[PDB]
Design an enzyme around this catalytic site. Structure first.
Site, mmCIF file in Angstrom:
data_model
loop_
_atom_site.group_PDB
_atom_site.id
_atom_site.type_symbol
_atom_site.label_atom_id
_atom_site.label_comp_id
_atom_site.label_asym_id
_atom_site.label_seq_id
_atom_site.Cartn_x
_atom_site.Cartn_y
_atom_site.Cartn_z
ATOM 1 N N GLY A 30 -52.453 -32.788 -49.764
ATOM 2 C CA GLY A 30 -52.142 -34.181 -49.441
ATOM 3 C C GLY A 30 -51.552 -34.416 -48.060
ATOM 4 O O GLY A 30 -51.467 -33.499 -47.233
ATOM 5 N N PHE A 34 -46.421 -37.623 -41.827
ATOM 6 C CA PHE A 34 -45.924 -36.737 -40.773
ATOM 7 C C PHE A 34 -46.727 -35.440 -40.626
ATOM 8 O O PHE A 34 -46.823 -34.901 -39.520
ATOM 9 C CB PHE A 34 -44.449 -36.402 -41.007
ATOM 10 C CG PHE A 34 -43.532 -37.586 -40.885
ATOM 11 C CD1 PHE A 34 -43.539 -38.367 -39.740
ATOM 12 C CD2 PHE A 34 -42.661 -37.915 -41.910
ATOM 13 C CE1 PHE A 34 -42.700 -39.459 -39.624
ATOM 14 C CE2 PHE A 34 -41.816 -39.004 -41.799
ATOM 15 C CZ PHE A 34 -41.836 -39.777 -40.654
ATOM 16 N N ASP A 142 -35.805 -42.183 -46.747
ATOM 17 C CA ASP A 142 -37.216 -42.328 -47.141
ATOM 18 C C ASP A 142 -37.459 -41.887 -48.595
ATOM 19 O O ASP A 142 -38.430 -41.179 -48.895
ATOM 20 C CB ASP A 142 -38.127 -41.564 -46.157
ATOM 21 C CG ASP A 142 -39.566 -42.098 -46.126
ATOM 22 O OD1 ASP A 142 -39.838 -43.225 -46.600
ATOM 23 O OD2 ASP A 142 -40.437 -41.377 -45.602
ATOM 24 N N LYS A 144 -38.865 -42.249 -52.067
ATOM 25 C CA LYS A 144 -40.040 -42.906 -52.639
ATOM 26 C C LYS A 144 -40.741 -41.930 -53.580
ATOM 27 O O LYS A 144 -40.496 -40.721 -53.516
ATOM 28 C CB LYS A 144 -40.995 -43.391 -51.538
ATOM 29 C CG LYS A 144 -41.445 -42.340 -50.538
ATOM 30 C CD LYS A 144 -42.369 -42.949 -49.494
ATOM 31 C CE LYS A 144 -42.816 -41.920 -48.471
ATOM 32 N NZ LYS A 144 -43.682 -42.514 -47.413
ATOM 33 N N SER A 145 -41.612 -42.451 -54.441
ATOM 34 C CA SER A 145 -42.291 -41.628 -55.442
ATOM 35 C C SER A 145 -43.202 -40.549 -54.840
ATOM 36 O O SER A 145 -43.392 -39.498 -55.451
ATOM 37 C CB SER A 145 -43.086 -42.504 -56.413
ATOM 38 O OG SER A 145 -44.050 -43.278 -55.725
ATOM 39 N N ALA A 146 -43.746 -40.805 -53.650
ATOM 40 C CA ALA A 146 -44.507 -39.792 -52.904
ATOM 41 C C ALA A 146 -43.661 -38.597 -52.426
ATOM 42 O O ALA A 146 -44.208 -37.528 -52.148
ATOM 43 C CB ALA A 146 -45.215 -40.434 -51.718
HETATM 44 C C1 LIG Z 1 -52.793 -29.652 -56.277
HETATM 45 C C2 LIG Z 1 -51.524 -30.370 -56.734
HETATM 46 C C3 LIG Z 1 -51.644 -30.774 -58.206
HETATM 47 C C4 LIG Z 1 -50.281 -29.473 -56.503
HETATM 48 C C5 LIG Z 1 -49.551 -30.165 -55.367
HETATM 49 C C6 LIG Z 1 -48.427 -29.808 -54.636
HETATM 50 C C7 LIG Z 1 -47.937 -30.630 -53.616
HETATM 51 N N1 LIG Z 1 -46.784 -30.312 -52.857
HETATM 52 C C8 LIG Z 1 -46.100 -29.142 -52.743
HETATM 53 O O1 LIG Z 1 -46.419 -28.126 -53.333
HETATM 54 C C9 LIG Z 1 -44.910 -29.130 -51.882
HETATM 55 C C10 LIG Z 1 -43.826 -28.237 -51.964
HETATM 56 N N2 LIG Z 1 -42.950 -28.548 -51.046
HETATM 57 N N3 LIG Z 1 -43.396 -29.656 -50.318
HETATM 58 C C11 LIG Z 1 -42.833 -30.341 -49.273
HETATM 59 C C12 LIG Z 1 -43.503 -31.407 -48.752
HETATM 60 C C13 LIG Z 1 -44.749 -31.751 -49.309
HETATM 61 N N4 LIG Z 1 -45.272 -31.070 -50.316
HETATM 62 C C14 LIG Z 1 -44.617 -30.022 -50.831
HETATM 63 C C15 LIG Z 1 -48.600 -31.846 -53.348
HETATM 64 N N5 LIG Z 1 -48.106 -32.686 -52.322
HETATM 65 C C16 LIG Z 1 -49.048 -32.895 -51.193
HETATM 66 C C17 LIG Z 1 -48.370 -33.699 -50.072
HETATM 67 O O2 LIG Z 1 -47.750 -34.873 -50.623
HETATM 68 C C18 LIG Z 1 -46.765 -34.648 -51.646
HETATM 69 C C19 LIG Z 1 -47.421 -33.903 -52.819
HETATM 70 C C20 LIG Z 1 -49.733 -32.199 -54.094
HETATM 71 C C21 LIG Z 1 -50.215 -31.362 -55.106
HETATM 72 O O3 LIG Z 1 -51.288 -31.536 -55.927
#
Ligand SMILES: CC1(C)Cc2cc(NC(=O)c3cnn4cccnc34)c(N3CCOCC3)cc2O1
Length: 283
Positions: A30, A34, A142, A144-146
């Site tokens: 995702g 940033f 910041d 938020k649910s995201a």
């Molecule tokens: C495939 C799955 C189902 C597993 C998974 C993990 C994370 N994220 C992380 O693993 C993660 C760990 N620390 N971190 C710090 C910032 C952003 N993401 C993360 C995210 N993120 C992407 C960026 O937006 C937020 C959600 C989505 C996602 O979908």
């Protein structure tokens, strides 16, 4: 003590940063605004590698690392390492298998709706993370649910501390407008603004609706508070219909917390410790 990776080591972790859809065999998971977040493997550990003006982005990078060095907590994401050797910025985190609260509330990629029981524990977890930040004299700015991530057990992890301030007004107003308190939009920095944003998150948890929807009335989710106060809608009208285990008493208790969090005068809102206690009493 974080592991100072070279950028080349992180190329071998991330397959030289491959692109999109993980639901159909890709690696990119995702993007918040940033950086782009990639899935990788350091030995057998699954990791999330975030690849990020230059001065402002470099300042957020340093602030992320500074906040993470000081703040370790089960409801905060864990930074494993960083790299900033050849004019390129990376942050490596512990992988969160269930993604963001936003994604799970929207049932992105066929995941089942979150139960009310799980939603209450997520709310409590997120409040505990914010409490820890505020106890350590940090404003997130910041919420938020995201930016609330979920591990294998759906434990809530607060993420993204690039805009955080170690607590006054500011010139550069930052944040996501649908979550921001009026005083934050006016340019004030205060932990009371994090409380307001958490109120919007609680409304997302109750309703399953996005914080903003240009194709709906009211466009901003926070405005349902006014509809409910004027009795043209009820909390029951807005409760997420993708749950079957939501009792009226505990839903009303969470809404009461969200309503207090969304008080338009900043000084009438509860502090995070009170929010924590109100959610504890709800369960
Ligand atoms: C495939 C799955 C189902 C597993 C998974 C993990 C994370 N994220 C992380 O693993 C993660 C760990 N620390 N971190 C710090 C910032 C952003 N993401 C993360 C995210 N993120 C992407 C960026 O937006 C937020 C959600 C989505 C996602 O979908």
């Amino acid at each position: 003590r974080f592991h100072s990776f070279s950028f080349y080591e992180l190329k071998n972790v991330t397959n030289n940063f491959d692109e999109r859809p993980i639901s159909v065999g890709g690696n990119k998971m995702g993007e918040g605004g940033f950086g782009v977040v990639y899935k990788g493997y350091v030995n057998n550990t699954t990791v999330a590698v975030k690849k990020l003006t230059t001065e402002e982005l470099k300042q957020q990078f340093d602030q992320e690392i500074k906040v993470m060095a000081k703040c370790q907590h089960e409801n905060l994401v864990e930074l494993l390492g960083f790299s900033s050797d050849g004019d390129d910025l990376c942050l490596v985190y512990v992988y969160m298998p269930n993604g963001s609260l936003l994604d799970r509330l929207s049932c992105l990629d066929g995941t089942p709706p979150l139960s009310w029981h799980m939603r209450c524990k997520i709310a409590q977890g997120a409040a505990n993370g914010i409490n820890f930040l505020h106890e350590n004299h940090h404003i997130h700015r910041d919420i938020k649910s995201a930016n609330i991530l979920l591990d294998e057990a759906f434990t809530a992890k607060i993420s993204d501390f690039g805009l955080a301030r170690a607590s006054v007004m500011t010139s550069r107003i930052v944040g996501t407008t649908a979550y921001m308190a009026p005083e934050a939009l006016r340019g004030e920095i205060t932990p009371k603004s994090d409380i307001y944003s958490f109120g919007v998150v609680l409304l997302e948890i109750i309703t399953g609706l996005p914080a903003v929807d240009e194709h709906r009335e009211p466009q901003l989710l926070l405005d349902i508070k006014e509809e409910i106060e004027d009795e043209e809608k009820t909390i029951e009208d807005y409760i997420d219909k993708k749950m079957n285990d939501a009792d009226s008493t505990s839903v009303e208790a969470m809404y009461s917390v969200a309503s207090q969090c969304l008080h338009e005068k900043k000084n009438k809102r509860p502090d995070i410790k009170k929010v924590q206690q109100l959610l504890q009493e709800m369960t």
